């Protein structure tokens, strides 16, 4: 195998590293996987389709302009170069290799397109038409943004966009399901807590956080239980950043944030899909859980879950490992159909006050076709009132003892509107048996005499009843 000759490939440290601080992408290339036949679309501010490092892989069938309602996602050029982000992300996935220009994409033989959707008012219809673009042609969608990362917003897909997620994972990709890759957020300095973002908090999105070059949690990172894994991105000014294509046929060395991590993951998922085109949307999440690597990622919350895997709210299961992903994909056995076990927990509303604990022992739908012995995602769908929402912290403990943070205190969130059937999601109990005692903890982290009431707690379990591996 001959590594790329592109002039900035040596600067793509998160691919070309020889120090083991990389995504292990060369190992996938050397197994023969480069993204050939796979189609990825960047949901963002447009894509410079004539960029010298994108044109050779550009796919009009992976593109649309939902801001101006036409097929051409070319960015709107401005003095401040506002609409450059989709072009940066596109090159992360699929910049052309061995052509003397900039660097390379993770999946440098994949086809790449973009939906111009963020350069205008982002409505529910705009979101739905983007998520649902050409779902039997596009395999993988990459989205780096969501509701405001101000540390005080709770929002997610409205009805059309949520319908687009369900249609995508159910009928998309010939019934195997669209793969939606999401950035978990850039709200770290606002103390944002990313289960409050219903896009990354969705089970239908494969959610990705960031690590700095020296292996630390970047200033912009949001911790939450819905995240599944990590790719490298930017950090402090002694740490390198992401190197990729830029607007006006240029090359940047200063692409940053969790919004630069999701495209790298989308590229790795493209290599993995080339290795096994029959993988379902759930299969892909299983592969990420099983192959991602905690080693040398620094966090104070690494915890071993009930099946022996280390998990962090900053990093999920750790750094994506492209060589391991493509190796495990090749002989992967499709998972069983998804079961869903609904458990209404409360027998009466509960005052929250300073602290509330709710304990319930469940059988996880024993005796039913939705019996789950092998968990995937779990949700605590909560309806509660509180006088100042950001003073709340919420934890969920599984029968195996895994403590998922559902919500951390958000100092800027002054809302008195509480949570209205908000489906807080955790990935940290993946492959555990969910039968037994679950514990929900709601705590007032402030010294103020805050008040409110929990009126509904639905525990929703997803998973199967077959196929488990020996614990790690
Ligand atoms: C270098 O940085 C470049 C600068 N760039 C500027 C533009 N930008 C940006 C602009 C707007 C933005 O707003 C948003 C805001 C949302 C949240 N939703 C919630 C539902 C709401 C409609 N409720 C109802 C009841 O009907 C409409 C807004 C979602 C997304 C979103 C959705 C999808 Cl499916 C894919 C992607 Cl990608 C984003 N997007 C997020 N980001 C990102 C930064
Ligand atoms: C894809 O997986 C399904 C489910 O196991 C199987 O029935 C089908 O034969 C597979 N298709 C290919 C082309 O391998
Ligand atoms: Ca256009
Ligand atoms: Ca190149
Ligand atoms: Ca956020
Ligand atoms: Cl469902
Ligand atoms: Na965000
Ligand atoms: Na997700
Ligand atoms: Na444990
Ligand atoms: Na149990």
Domain co-membership, 172 together with 45: yes
Atom of ligand 1 nearest to the CA of 257: 1
Question: Whose Cα sits closest to atom 31 in ligand 1?
Answer: 146
Q: Is 89 helix (H, G, I), strand (E, B) or coil?
A: helix
Question: Whose Cα sits closest to atom 1 in ligand 2?
Answer: 278
Structure tokens at 207: 């959610």
Question: Whose Cα sits closest to atom 8 in ligand 2?
Answer: 278
The CA distance from 271 to 181, in Å, is 14
Question: Is the residue at 259 inside a domain?
Answer: yes
Structure tokens at 25: 């992408």
Which of 308, 330, 352 marks a domain boundary? 330
Atom of ligand 1 nearest to the CA of 119: 7
**In angstroms, what CA-CA distances link 215 with 21, 211, 229, 258?**
8, 6, 14, 14
* Beta bridge partner(s), residue 441: 357, 395
Helix (H) or strand (E) holding 161: helix 159-171
Q: What CATH code is carried by the domain that includes residue 140?
A: 3.40.50.200
H helices of 51-106, in order, are 85-94
Q: Is 172 helix (H, G, I), strand (E, B) or coil?
A: coil
- Ligand 2 close to Cβ of residue 420 (< 6 A): no
Following DSSP, what letter does each residue of 119-153 receive, concatenated?
Answer: SS---HHHHHHHHTSSTTT--EEEE---S--SSS-
Query: Max alpha carbon distance in the chain (Å)?
Result: 67
Question: Is the residue at 472 inside a domain?
Answer: no
The alpha carbon torsion through 221, 224, 229, 233 (nearest 10 deg) reads 0
Domain co-membership, 234 together with 288: yes
Q: Is 94 helix (H, G, I), strand (E, B) or coil?
A: helix
Domain co-membership, 384 together with 320: no
- Active-site residue set: 44, 85, 259
* Beta bridge partner(s), residue 312: 316
Domain co-membership, 421 together with 311: no
Is 101 known to sit in a ligand binding site?
Answer: yes
DSSP state of 190: G
Asked whether 454 and 349 are in contact (CB, 8 A), the reply is yes
From 87, 89, 118, give the residue whose CB has the most ligand 1 atoms within 8 Å, as the site to mutate.
Answer: 118
Helix (H) or strand (E) holding 438: strand 436-444
Nearest to 337 by CA among 468, 171, 466, 204: 466
From 278, 279, 280, 464, give the residue whose CB has the most ligand 2 atoms within 8 Å, as the site to mutate.
Answer: 278
Is 463 known to sit in a ligand binding site?
Answer: no
Structure tokens at 197: 């973002």
* Beta bridge partner(s), residue 294: none
Following DSSP, what letter does each residue of 293-309 receive, concatenated?
Answer: B-TT---TT-EE-TTS-
Domains: count for the chain:
2
The CA distance from 428 to 376, in Å, is 9
The CA distance from 139 to 39, in Å, is 5
Domain co-membership, 326 together with 343: no
What domain range includes position 438? 339-464
Is 61 known to sit in a ligand binding site?
Answer: no
- Ligand 1 residue neighbourhood (C-beta within 6 Å): 43-45, 85, 118, 122-124, 127, 130-131, 143-147, 155, 158, 161
User: Whose structure tokens read 């669209």?
Assistant: 178
| Ligand 4 centroid, distance to 51 Cα (angstroms) | 10
Atom of ligand 1 nearest to the CA of 127: 34
User: Whose structure tokens read 């998804």?
Assistant: 338
Question: Is the residue at 255 inside a domain?
Answer: yes
Question: Is the residue at 470 inside a domain?
Answer: no
Structure tokens at 64: 């649309």
Nearest to 377 by CA among 261, 259, 281: 281
Q: Is 102 helix (H, G, I), strand (E, B) or coil?
A: coil
Domain co-membership, 276 together with 392: no
**In angstroms, what CA-CA distances link 385 with 6, 300, 389?**
56, 31, 8
Phi then psi for 42, rounded to 5 degrees? -95, 120
Nearest to 156 by CA among 192, 195, 117: 195
Question: Is the residue at 2 inside a domain?
Answer: no
- Ligand 2 close to Cβ of residue 330 (< 6 A): no
Is 59 known to sit in a ligand binding site?
Answer: no
Domain co-membership, 23 together with 85: yes
The CA distance from 138 to 63, in Å, is 9
| Ligand 10 centroid, distance to 106 Cα (angstroms) | 41
Atom of ligand 2 nearest to the CA of 333: 5
Following DSSP, what letter does each residue of 307-359 receive, concatenated?
Answer: TS-EEBTTTBT-B--HHHHHHHHTTPPPPPPPEEEEEE--SS-EE-TTEEEEE
Phi then psi for 74, rounded to 5 degrees? -55, 135
Asked whether 430 and 289 are in contact (CB, 8 A), the reply is yes
Asked whether 41 and 107 are in contact (CB, 8 A), the reply is no
- Ligand 2 close to Cβ of residue 334 (< 6 A): yes
Q: Is 426 helix (H, G, I), strand (E, B) or coil?
A: strand
| Ligand 7 centroid, distance to 224 Cα (angstroms) | 13
Please classify residue 451 by burial: count the beta carbons closer than 10 Å to its beta carbon, then call 0-12 exposed, 13-18 middle and 19+ buried.
middle
Nearest to 398 by CA among 445, 430, 365: 430
Cα 239 to chain center, whole Å?
23
Is 217 known to sit in a ligand binding site?
Answer: no
Following DSSP, what letter does each residue of 389-421 receive, concatenated?
Answer: GGGEEEEEE-TT--EEEEE---TT---SS-EEE
Structure tokens at 337: 């159909």
The CA distance from 259 to 323, in Å, is 23
Question: Taking ligand 9, which is a single-atom ion, which protein residues have CB atoms under 5 Å away?
Answer: 304, 401
Atom of ligand 1 nearest to the CA of 156: 19
Q: Is 11 helix (H, G, I), strand (E, B) or coil?
A: helix
Left if phi > 0, otherwise alpha if psi is -120 to 50, otherwise beta: which for 192? beta
Domain co-membership, 297 together with 178: yes
Question: Is the residue at 4 inside a domain?
Answer: no
Asked whether 319 and 231 are in contact (CB, 8 A), the reply is yes
Is 83 known to sit in a ligand binding site?
Answer: yes
For the chain, what is the radius of gyration of the CA atoms?
21
Q: What CATH code is carried by the domain that includes residue 365?
A: 2.60.120.260
Which of 264, 297, 330 marks a domain boundary? 330
Helix (H) or strand (E) holding 376: strand 374-386
Please classify residue 344 by burial: count the beta carbons closer than 10 Å to its beta carbon, then call 0-12 exposed, 13-18 middle and 19+ buried.
exposed
Structure tokens at 103: 């660097």
Phi then psi for 239, rounded to 5 degrees? -105, 145
The CA distance from 403 to 390, in Å, is 20
Nearest listed ligand to the Cα of residue 330: 2
Which of 304, 330, 356 marks a domain boundary? 330
The CA distance from 236 to 241, in Å, is 9
Domain co-membership, 138 together with 177: yes
| Ligand 9 centroid, distance to 307 Cα (angstroms) | 8
The DSSP bridge pattern shows strands 39-44 and 111-116 to be: parallel
Asked whether 395 and 406 are in contact (CB, 8 A), the reply is yes
Q: Is 85 helix (H, G, I), strand (E, B) or coil?
A: helix
- The total of other beta-carbon atoms located within 10 Å of residue 94's CB is 36
| Ligand 8 centroid, distance to 121 Cα (angstroms) | 24
Domain co-membership, 356 together with 295: no
Question: Whose Cα sits closest to atom 17 in ligand 1?
Answer: 147
**In angstroms, what CA-CA distances link 339 with 221, 281, 335, 343, 365?**
32, 15, 11, 13, 10
Question: Whose Cα sits closest to atom 14 in ligand 2?
Answer: 278
Question: Is the residue at 428 inside a domain?
Answer: yes
| Ligand 4 centroid, distance to 282 Cα (angstroms) | 32
Domain co-membership, 348 together with 202: no
Question: Whose Cα sits closest to atom 12 in ligand 2?
Answer: 278
Question: Is the residue at 141 inside a domain?
Answer: yes
Structure tokens at 234: 């930017």
Domain co-membership, 218 together with 351: no
Following DSSP, what letter does each residue of 228-280 receive, concatenated?
Answer: -EEEE---STTS--EEEEETTTEEEEEE-SGGGHHHHHHHHHHHHHHH-TT--
Is 444 known to sit in a ligand binding site?
Answer: no
- The total of other beta-carbon atoms located within 10 Å of residue 156's CB is 19
The CA distance from 81 to 19, in Å, is 35
User: Whose structure tokens read 């003397």?
Assistant: 100
């Amino acid at each position: 195998y001959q590594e790329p000759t592109d002039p900035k490939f040596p600067q793509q440290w998160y691919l070309s590293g020889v120090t083991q601080r990389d995504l292990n992408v060369k190992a996938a290339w050397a197994q023969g996987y480069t993204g050939h036949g796979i189609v990825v679309s960047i949901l963002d501010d447009g894509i410079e389709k004539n960029h010298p490092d994108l044109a050779g892989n550009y796919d009009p069938g992976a593109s649309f302009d939902v801001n101006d309602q036409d097929p051409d996602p070319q960015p709107r050029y401005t003095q401040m170069n506002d609409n450059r982000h989709g072009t940066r992300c596109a090159g992360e996935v699929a910049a052309v290799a061995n052509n003397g220009v900039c660097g390379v994409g993770v999946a440098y033989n994949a086809r790449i397109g973009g939906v111009r959707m963020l350069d205008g008012e982002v409505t529910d219809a705009v979101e739905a038409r983007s998520l649902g673009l050409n779902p039997n042609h596009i395999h993988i969608y990459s989205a780096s943004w969501g509701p405001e990362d101000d540390g005080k917003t709770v929002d997610g897909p409205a009805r059309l966009a949520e319908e687009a997620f369900f249609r995508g994972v159910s009928q998309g990709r010939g019934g195997l399901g669209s793969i939606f890759v999401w950035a978990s957020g850039n709200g770290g300095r606002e103390h944002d807590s990313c289960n409050c973002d219903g896009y990354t908090n969705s089970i239908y999105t494969l959610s990705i956080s960031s690590a700095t070059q020296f292996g630390n949690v970047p200033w912009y990172s949001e911790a939450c239980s819905s995240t599944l894994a990590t790719t490298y991105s930017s950090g402090n000014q002694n740490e390198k950043q992401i190197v990729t294509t830029d607007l006006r046929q240029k090359c940047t060395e200063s692409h940053t944030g969790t919004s630069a991590s999701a495209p790298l993951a989308a590229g790795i998922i493209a290599l993995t899909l080339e290795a096994n085109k029959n993988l379902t949307w759930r299969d892909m999440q299983h592969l990420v859980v099983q192959t991602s690597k905690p080693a040398h990622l620094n966090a104070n919350d690494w915890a071993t879950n009930g099946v022996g895997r280390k998990v962090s709210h900053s990093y999920g299961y750790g750094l994506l490992d492209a060589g391991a992903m493509v190796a495990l994909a090749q002989n992967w056995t499709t998972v069983a159909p998804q079961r869903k076990c609904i458990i209404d927990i409360l027998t009466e509303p509960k005052d929250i006050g300073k602290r509330l604990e709710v304990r319930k022992t469940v059988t996880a739908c024993l005796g039913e076709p939705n019996h789950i012995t092998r968990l995937e995602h779990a949700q605590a769908r909560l309806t509660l009132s509180y006088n100042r929402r950001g003073d709340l912290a919420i934890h969920l403990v599984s029968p195996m003892g895994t403590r998922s943070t559902l919500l951390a205190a958000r100092p800027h969130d002054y809302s008195a509107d509480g949570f209205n059937d908000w489906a807080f999601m955790t990935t940290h109990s993946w492959d555990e048996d969910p039968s037994g005692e679950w514990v929900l903890e709601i705590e007032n982290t402030s010294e103020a005499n805050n008040y409110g009431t929990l009126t509904k707690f639905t525990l929703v379990l997803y998973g199967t009843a077959s196929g488990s591996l020996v614990p790690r």
